[PDB]
Scaffold this active site. Structure first.
Site, PDB file in Angstrom:
ATOM      1  N   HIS A 115       0.754  -1.245   0.000  1.00 29.09           N
ATOM      2  CA  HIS A 115       0.000   0.000   0.000  1.00 29.09           C
ATOM      3  C   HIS A 115       0.793   1.309   0.000  1.00 29.09           C
ATOM      4  CE1 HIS A 115      -3.619  -2.333   0.375  1.00 29.09           C
ATOM      5  NE2 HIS A 115      -3.195  -2.905   1.489  1.00 29.09           N
TER       6      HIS A 115
ATOM      7  N   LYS B  43      -4.347 -10.198  -8.149  1.00 29.02           N
ATOM      8  CA  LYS B  43      -5.156  -9.531  -7.139  1.00 29.02           C
ATOM      9  C   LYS B  43      -6.184  -8.672  -7.848  1.00 29.02           C
ATOM     10  CE  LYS B  43      -4.885  -7.097  -2.723  1.00 29.02           C
ATOM     11  NZ  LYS B  43      -4.277  -6.013  -1.899  1.00 29.02           N
ATOM     12  N   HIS B  44      -7.436  -8.771  -7.419  1.00 24.55           N
ATOM     13  CA  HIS B  44      -8.529  -8.140  -8.151  1.00 24.55           C
ATOM     14  C   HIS B  44      -8.557  -6.634  -7.961  1.00 24.55           C
ATOM     15  CE1 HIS B  44     -11.166 -11.997  -8.657  1.00 24.55           C
ATOM     16  NE2 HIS B  44      -9.930 -12.148  -9.097  1.00 24.55           N
ATOM     17  N   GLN B  45      -8.067  -6.178  -6.816  1.00 21.01           N
ATOM     18  CA  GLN B  45      -8.043  -4.754  -6.515  1.00 21.01           C
ATOM     19  C   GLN B  45      -6.900  -4.427  -5.565  1.00 21.01           C
ATOM     20  OE1 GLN B  45      -8.669  -2.859  -3.574  1.00 21.01           O
ATOM     21  NE2 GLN B  45      -8.681  -0.884  -4.645  1.00 21.01           N
ATOM     22  N   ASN B  46      -6.333  -3.232  -5.699  1.00 17.60           N
ATOM     23  CA  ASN B  46      -5.387  -2.744  -4.703  1.00 17.60           C
ATOM     24  C   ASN B  46      -5.310  -1.230  -4.680  1.00 17.60           C
ATOM     25  OD1 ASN B  46      -3.410  -3.391  -2.621  1.00 17.60           O
ATOM     26  ND2 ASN B  46      -1.919  -2.440  -4.000  1.00 17.60           N
ATOM     27  N   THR B  47      -5.238  -0.680  -3.477  1.00 16.04           N
ATOM     28  CA  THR B  47      -5.109   0.752  -3.307  1.00 16.04           C
ATOM     29  C   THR B  47      -3.688   1.113  -2.898  1.00 16.04           C
ATOM     30  OG1 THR B  47      -7.401   0.832  -2.558  1.00 16.04           O
ATOM     31  CG2 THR B  47      -6.041   2.791  -2.177  1.00 16.04           C
TER      32      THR B  47
ATOM     33  N   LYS C 274     -13.288  -2.110  10.898  1.00 16.32           N
ATOM     34  CA  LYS C 274     -14.370  -2.878  10.297  1.00 16.32           C
ATOM     35  C   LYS C 274     -14.555  -4.205  11.021  1.00 16.32           C
ATOM     36  CE  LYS C 274     -14.500  -1.021   5.610  1.00 16.32           C
ATOM     37  NZ  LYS C 274     -13.854  -1.031   4.271  1.00 16.32           N
TER      38      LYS C 274
ATOM     39  N   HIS D 215      -2.782  -2.865   8.347  1.00 14.51           N
ATOM     40  CA  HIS D 215      -3.901  -3.046   7.428  1.00 14.51           C
ATOM     41  C   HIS D 215      -4.477  -1.718   6.975  1.00 14.51           C
ATOM     42  CE1 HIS D 215      -3.893  -7.322   8.146  1.00 14.51           C
ATOM     43  NE2 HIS D 215      -4.080  -7.146   9.442  1.00 14.51           N
TER      44      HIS D 215
END
Length: 128
Positions: free
Chosen positions: A16, A39-43, A64, A123
């Site tokens: 990240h 990986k389908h998504q990453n920020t 969360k 995280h």
């Protein structure tokens, strides 16, 4: 090659932390190799590890997962959202979307092989 077992904080930095915006396909290739899939998504947060780790010293809030080791940035930061649009591993291709948002990180006391801060980020809880 990244080593065999990374700490959660080290993996957070790898996954990240990217202060100058890069090419999504290039940036993801390493992460995808280590996980052996697309990986389908990453920020990616376009800020320094030092700046992000500093957020750990701010007021603790609920995550969360309902733990209370989360912390919100005091300001928004530039970030990029990489979304998988095609390919099977290892040929993973992405689209990029820039954002300017606050973020919330989960933080833990460092492990021995981590930089000896009071807390380190482990995280990316959310972006808001």
């Amino acid at each position: 090659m990244w080593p065999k077992r990374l700490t959660k904080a080290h993996w957070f930095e790898i996954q990240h932390i990217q202060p100058s915006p890069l090419q999504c396909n290039r940036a993801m290739s390493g992460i995808n190799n280590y996980t052996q899939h697309c990986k389908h998504q990453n920020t990616f947060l376009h800020d320094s590890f030092q700046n992000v780790a500093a957020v750990c010293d701010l007021l603790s809030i609920v995550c969360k997962n309902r733990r209370h080791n989360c912390h919100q940035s005091s300001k928004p930061v530039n970030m990029t959202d990489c979304r998988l649009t095609s390919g099977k591993y290892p040929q993973c291709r992405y689209s990029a979307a820039a954002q300017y948002k606050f973020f919330i990180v989960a933080c833990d006391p460092p492990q021995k092989s981590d930089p000896p801060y009071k807390l380190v980020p482990v995280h990316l809880d959310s972006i808001l």
